[PDB]
Amino acid sequence: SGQIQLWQFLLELLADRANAGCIAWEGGHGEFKLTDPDEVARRWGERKSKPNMNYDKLSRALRYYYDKNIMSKVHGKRYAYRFDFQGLAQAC
DNA sequence: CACTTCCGGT
DNA sequence: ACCGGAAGTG
């Protein structure tokens, strides 16, 4: 469609320490955490033109990435996901 | 296409 | 919180 993709949006946030308040790399091996899921969802909505966006819908988008091998869940760790760069590369 | 909505189930 | 099927939006 041309619109910005979620993975790009998240990498941009994660590439700036200024955003550690809501999202940051943590744990290691591509692991990151949404330290403020509501905030991240708000930014995503605003950035995407979907004002009724929330973590419920955002996380669903993240889960959609599971099948694409672009991301996976850190099982048992609240709000903690894992970026798969090899998978991202294989998608290109 | 790449999500966004919705929501019953774990 | 997290999962994931199914139908809908730009």
Author numbering: 44 to 135
What did the authors write?
The Ets transcription factor family consists of 28 genes in humans containing the evolutionarily conserved 85 amino acid Ets DNA-binding domain, originally identified as a viral oncogene (E26 transformation-specific). The Ets domain is a variant helix-turn-helix (winged helix) structure, comprising three α-helices and a four-stranded antiparallel β-sheet. Here, we present the crystal structures of the Ets domains of the entire PEA3 subfamily (Etv1, Etv4, and Etv5) together with the structure of the Erg family member (Fev). Furthermore, a new Ets dimerization interface linked by a redox-sensitive disulfide bond is identified, and this dimerization is shown to result in a significant inhibition of DNA binding, potentially linking Ets transcription factors with cellular redox regulatory mechanisms.
In the DNA complex structures of Etv5 and Fev (which are determined to 1.9 and 2.0 Å resolution, respectively), we observe a network of coordinated water molecules contributing to sequence recognition upstream to the GGA core. From analysis of the high resolution structures of the Etv5 and Fev DNA complexes (which are high enough resolution (< 2.0 Å) to reliably locate ordered waters), a number of additional contacts can be seen, which appear to enable direct readout of additional base pairs both upstream and downstream of the GGA core. The two C-G base pairs at positions −2 and −1 lie close to a highly coordinated network of four water molecules conserved in both structures and are coordinated by polar contacts to the side chains of Asp-387 (Fev Asp-99), Ser-390 (Fev Ser-102), Arg-394 (Fev Arg-106), Tyr-412 (Fev Tyr-124), and the phosphate oxygens of the two cytosine nucleotides at positions −2 and −1. The requirement in this network for the water closest to the base at position −1 to be a hydrogen bond acceptor almost perfectly explains the observed sequence preferences at this position, with a strong selection of cytosine (∼75% occurrence) and the only other allowed base being adenine (∼15% occurrence), which is also able to donate a hydrogen bond, although in this case the hydrogen bonding distance would be significantly longer (≈4.0 Å). In the Etv5 and Fev DNA complex structures, the corresponding residue (Etv5-Tyr-428 and Fev-Tyr-107, respectively) can be seen to occupy two conformations, one in which the two interactions detailed above are conserved, and an additional conformation where the side chain hydroxyl lies close to Etv5-Lys-432/Fev-Lys-111 and provides a large contact surface, with the potential for favorable van der Waals interactions to bases at positions +5 and +6 on the complementary strand. The finding that both conformations of this residue appear to occur together indicates that the dynamic nature of the side chains of the recognition helix may be even more important for DNA recognition than previously thought.
